[PDB]
Amino acid sequence: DMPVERILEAELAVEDPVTNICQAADKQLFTLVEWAKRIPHFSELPLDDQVILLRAGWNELLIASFSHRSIAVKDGILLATGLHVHRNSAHSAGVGAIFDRVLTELVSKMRDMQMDKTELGCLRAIVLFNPDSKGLSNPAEVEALREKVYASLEAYCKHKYPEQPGRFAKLLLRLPALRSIGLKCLEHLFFFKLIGDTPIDTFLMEMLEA
């Protein structure tokens, strides 16, 4: 009903440093739409609810994506544009705190547990199927899809890593940190928009709309 194979397929189908980061974010919103279209039963929801889910979860989804991407590197983040932001660059641009939070609470833990792409895709699908999203035409259907995602995820974990009985819960317990970090990053984005001395592209700007 919610096979982890299709979720993994969705992940593999989509393959001032603050300015570069904003460029990469705008580039990856377009890609996020396609990714979400490849998640089972997402396209079958009402279009308004698809809009609501993506607008509620885009920042967390993209943060998870590049945090997992940056496993291969140390003290840095790999942007989807093929550009590397070093910890020192971020600190010298005045955004060292949130960057260190990303490296410490997300990237290094993903690397410590060797979180694979299937698990990343399942966590992102859980984030996508956020039943607390305000305005959902039917939050019960979204809740059910979320339950199916984490059922399949727990099954995959107990089959692939039978020696780690706590791996499922450890995967789920990174979601609070992802939520906090996403909120903080959104705050930074709104400050950049208000200040208006940082170029924000059209899709990112639309995500900043009311």
Partner: peptide
Amino acid sequence: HKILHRLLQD
């Protein structure tokens, strides 16, 4: 939300 709607419909 023009852009998101257009991308979701196609």
